[PDB]
Amino acid sequence: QPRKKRPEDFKFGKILGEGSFSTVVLARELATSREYAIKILEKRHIIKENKVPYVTRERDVMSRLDHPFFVKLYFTFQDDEKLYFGLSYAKNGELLKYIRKIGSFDETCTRFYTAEIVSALEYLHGKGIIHRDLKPENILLNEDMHIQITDFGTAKVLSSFVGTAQYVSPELLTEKSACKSSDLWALGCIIYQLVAGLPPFRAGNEYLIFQKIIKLEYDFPEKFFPKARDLVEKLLVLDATKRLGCEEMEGYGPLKAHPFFESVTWENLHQQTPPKL
Numbered sequence: 001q002p003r004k005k006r007p008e009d010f011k012f013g014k015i016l017g018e019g020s021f022s023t024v025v026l027a028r029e030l031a032t033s034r035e036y037a038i039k040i041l042e043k044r045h046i047i048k049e050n051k052v053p054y055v056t057r058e059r060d061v062m063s064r065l066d067h068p069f070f071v072k073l074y075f076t077f078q079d080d081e082k083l084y085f086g087l088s089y090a091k092n093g094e095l096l097k098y099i100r101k102i103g104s105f106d107e108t109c110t111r112f113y114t115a116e117i118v119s120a121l122e123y124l125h126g127k128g129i130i131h132r133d134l135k136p137e138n139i140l141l142n143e144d145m146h147i148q149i150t151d152f153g154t155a156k157v158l159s160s161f162v163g164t165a166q167y168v169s170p171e172l173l174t175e176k177s178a179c180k181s182s183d184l185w186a187l188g189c190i191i192y193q194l195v196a197g198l199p200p201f202r203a204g205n206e207y208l209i210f211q212k213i214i215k216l217e218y219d220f221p222e223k224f225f226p227k228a229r230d231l232v233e234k235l236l237v238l239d240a241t242k243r244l245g246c247e248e249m250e251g252y253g254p255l256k257a258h259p260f261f262e263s264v265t266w267e268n269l270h271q272q273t274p275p276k277l
């Protein structure tokens with residue numbers, strides 16, 4: 001392995017993302033002219049807030065992932081005050097940006113991008129890993145317009161915390177208990193959001209959102225691809241064990257075989273040319 005890199009190895013530029021405990025900065029490594037998304041974390045703040053386990057889990061998970069639909073951790077280093085994670089740079093940014101830009105996706109784009117997310121999840125879940133906070137902000141777009149899912153500090157590694165309110169599954173609001181089905185619920189929301197342009201559970205505040213979730217209080221616009229709607233209904237199911245794609249439903253076989261994916265070739269998605277938005 002190469003020498004431990006250092007801040008002076010890079011020319012830093014614009015800010016790509018911001019979280020409570022981190023900032024993502026675009027940086028060009030000088031010796032290679034490669035662009036990386038460097039995630040910068042202030043040690044003191046992490047310790048002060050008891051986030052060390054989250055930072056640790058992210059590093060450990062993003063190292064174990066080796067798949068085109070996931071942002072990669074290439075390296076790490078630190079100075080006196082800060083940790084640096086060198087991440088894949090997804091030039092086109094958040095999927096959320098595109099949902100806003102174009103309003104909502106047509107069937108073909110919905111189909112392609114949903115299949116990529118399913119395929120990513122299948123890989124993630126195959127490694128006994130749960131994202132727990134899947135959302136359009138987390139689903140980045142590469143320069144070639146394929147997805148790269150990021151942000152893994154809140155993931156769980158199958159042998160406490162609540163993600164973004166709108167994508168939170170009912171079981172989290174009723175037991176503090178998560179599983180692969182939690183990601184599948186989020187998948188249901190995200191699909192709904194690609195088609196309708198908005199997330200299925202909206203309200204004035206988090207409490208009300210949570211109220212709708214446990215009540216399964218949402219509904220479909222009249223202009224909602226029927227097969228997409230049928231799939232969404234098989235995902236947004238209160239009982240976590242009855243969600244298409246989960247182990248009690250026999251996994252990703254039946255999920256990938258859903259009529260909505262009729263025209264999908266699952267094996268080489270990443271090699272296919274994404275439909276234009």
Ligand SMILES: Nc1nc(-c2ccc3c(N)[nH]nc3c2)cc(N2CCOCC2)n1
Pocket residue numbers: 016017018019020022024037039071087088089090091093140150151152
């Ligand atoms: N892992 C992780 N990645 C990113 C991130 C953001 C933009 C990126 C890009 N354009 N290429 N790569 C990127 C990675 C942010 C993040 N934060 C931000 C929000 O707070 C939660 C954690 N965490």
